[PDB]
Amino acid sequence: MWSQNDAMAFGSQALATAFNLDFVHYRSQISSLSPRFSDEGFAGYVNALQASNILETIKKEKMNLTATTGAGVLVRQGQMSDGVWFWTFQYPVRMRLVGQTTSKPEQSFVFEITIQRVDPRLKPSGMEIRQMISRNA
């Protein structure tokens, strides 16, 4: 298993979960995503949320975050010095803060995600995101 197509699907699934957040349950949604990331990877997600002021806006304005991930592509793959295989993908992502009475403007990005292999004895997916970088599109 662990084909590049499997890894691409893992990344798009992670992005879908990461950026569809509910104004009531967002903290629990976010913590539940941790298994998809290394802790350094998760820092990139936290940075992406902060760069768009997501958490404060969700909390203060009672807005949900919605997002759609487009078709992604493999940039490169290989192994690190440690013999651990990785894949780097980029995906278009559009997201929008949406409230009951109104919304914020949609924002468009390309996310770069590097996924590395993990011992399946530790994480049964055998994968985790070790780096997440948001770029404006």
Residue numbers in the entry: 90 to 226
Please give sentences taken from the publication describing this entry.
DotI is a 23 kDa inner membrane protein essential for intracellular growth of L. pneumophila within mammalian and protozoan cells. DotI is conserved in all of the identified type IVB secretion systems, including the conjugation systems of R64 and related plasmids. Structural analysis of the periplasmic domains of DotI and its R64 ortholog TraM demonstrated that DotI and TraM are structural homologs of the T4ASS protein VirB8.
To gain insight into the role(s) of DotI in type IVB secretion, we determined the crystal structures of the C-terminal periplasmic domains of DotI (residues 73-212, DotIC) and its conjugative plasmid R64 ortholog TraM (residues 91-230, TraMC). The structure of TraMC was determined at 1.5 Å resolution with the working R and the free R factor of 18.0% and 20.7%, respectively. The crystallographic asymmetric unit contains a single molecule. As expected from the considerable amino-acid sequence similarity between DotIC and TraMC (30% identity, 54% similarity), the structure of TraMC is similar to that of DotIC. They can be superimposed with an rmsd (root mean square deviation) for corresponding Cα atoms (106 of 137 atoms) of 0.876 Å. The remarkable structural difference is the position of α3. α3 of TraMC leans to Sh2, thereby closing the cleft. To elucidate the oligomerization of TraM, we expressed and purified TraM using an E. coli expression system, and conducted SEC-MALS measurement.
